[PDB]
């Protein structure tokens, strides 16, 4: 959005030193129990394990492929929530302009709390009036006293929580078959051999499953000076 500042380096990828060292437990943790860093590396390890196995991709369904990469198959419930989330974020630093509100289609006023201050400017052209500010509280269909424009408050609330991308992913995504560490090892040997590492994440991940320091050059990789 225009109100956001510049992408960080982390916005693209995370450093491999932030990979959890207990990979064996990481790949067995349920999604609802994974933190932001743990969830990043669960998806990256599992997603790259399937993508770096070309011979199996054509026989893998899009439902299974999306699960491996950690992408959520969309549906009307989740689409509604995500859309209203992105609409809330956009309105943080953007103007609020849209069609005239009526009983059939009230002006939708997203909010996290139970109230949001709103102003009615009336219709277009000569039907526009001076700003009339009012407090839009949930559970009431508001009508402007001047132009009769109907307003309504929409709350981004779900089960004692507000709506977030993390909440939407946890509520609607279902964990599939438990990730098999044999796949990690098999793909690891595929792209990492004879001092050539073409899957750096899988070389670090396999090292942790082995106990940290087992694979060649990994003790030297983990030895820091400050």
């Amino acid at each position: 959005y225009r109100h956001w500042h510049r992408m960080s380096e982390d916005d693209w990828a995370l450093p491999l030193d932030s990979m959890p060292e207990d990979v064996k437990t990481l790949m067995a943790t349920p999604q609802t129990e994974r933190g932001f860093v743990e969830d990043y590396w669960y998806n990256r390890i599992r997603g790259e394990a399937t993508l770096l196995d070309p011979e199996a991709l054509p026989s893998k369904s899009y439902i299974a492929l999306a699960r491996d990469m950690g992408l959520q198959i969309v549906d009307e419930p989740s689409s509604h929530m995500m859309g209203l989330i992105e609409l809330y974020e956009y309105l943080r630093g953007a103007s609020f302009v849209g069609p005239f509100g009526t009983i059939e289609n009230p002006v939708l006023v997203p909010a996290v709390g139970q109230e949001r201050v709103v102003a009615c400017t009336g219709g277009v052209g000569d039907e526009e009036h001076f700003t009339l500010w009012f407090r839009c509280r949930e559970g009431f269909m508001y009508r402007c006293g001047e132009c009769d424009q109907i307003f309504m408050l929409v709350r981004l609330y779900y089960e004692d929580r507000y709506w977030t991308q993390t909440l939407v992913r946890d509520t609607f995504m279902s964990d599939g078959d438990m990730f098999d560490l044999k796949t990690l090892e098999r793909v690891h040997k595929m792209w990492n051999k004879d001092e050539m590492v073409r899957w750096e994440v899988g070389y670090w991940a396999q090292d942790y499953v082995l106990g940290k320091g087992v694979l060649p050059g990994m003790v030297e990789e983990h030895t820091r000076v400050n």
């Binding site: 933190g35 932001f36 996290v112 709390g113 139970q114 009036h129 509280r137 949930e138 559970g139 009431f140 006293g145 001047e146 709350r155 609330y157 089960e159 004692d160 929580r161 507000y162 977030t164 993390t166 909440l167 946890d170």
Partner: protein
């Protein structure tokens, strides 16, 4: 009727000047020992420790509210499904008698009326023109007089005598040509 008599009972006249006993009879300056009131004084005011000496904005009692999933507790709406539709019942504020005291009866009638706007665009535009140009005319009526009177002060006159006047602290010196 007298509306004050309705809520007279709630208003019990006070005993202490400024509503506090002498500090000797009760030390309101100390923090309350009641569980869950460590941030309050005995008289109910916020304790200096909570607000000044150990203010959280200064790094004391560091306790991040947001949880691991980036969530905070949010209270949901009063939802009531009905007629094949999910409804939300809004929270209505309590009767103003509870909060203010007067009994909400015999309220004078103030009808709904849309904003009192001035109409007749053509007429309004002419008035606004007059609001600006009637003063402009008056100024123009003063302009010519102002020029003339200014010119009059600064007129080369055939003066025949000179008096020099010097102002000093605190008296006026006068120099005049003496008759020959």
């Amino acid at each position: 009727k007298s509306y004050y008599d309705d809520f007279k009972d709630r208003l019990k006249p006070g005993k202490y000047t400024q509503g506090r006993c002498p500090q000797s009879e009760g030390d309101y300056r100390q923090e309350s020992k009641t569980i869950g009131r460590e941030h309050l004084n005995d008289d109910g005011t916020r304790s200096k420790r909570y607000t000044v000496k150990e203010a959280d904005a200064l790094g004391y009692h560091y306790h991040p509210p947001i949880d691991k999933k980036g969530q905070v507790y949010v209270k949901g709406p009063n939802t009531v499904i009905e007629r094949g539709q999910t409804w939300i019942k809004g929270y209505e504020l309590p009767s103003m008698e509870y909060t203010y005291g007067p009994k909400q009866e015999d309220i004078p009638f103030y009808p709904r009326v849309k904003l009192n706007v001035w109409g007749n665009y053509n007429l309004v535009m002419k008035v606004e023109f007059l609001f600006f140009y009637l003063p402009t005319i008056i100024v123009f009526g003063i302009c010519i007089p102002v020029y003339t009177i200014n010119f009059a002060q600064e007129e080369v006159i055939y003066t025949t005598m000179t008096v020099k006047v010097t102002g000093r602290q605190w008296y006026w010196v006068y120099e005049v040509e003496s008759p020959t």
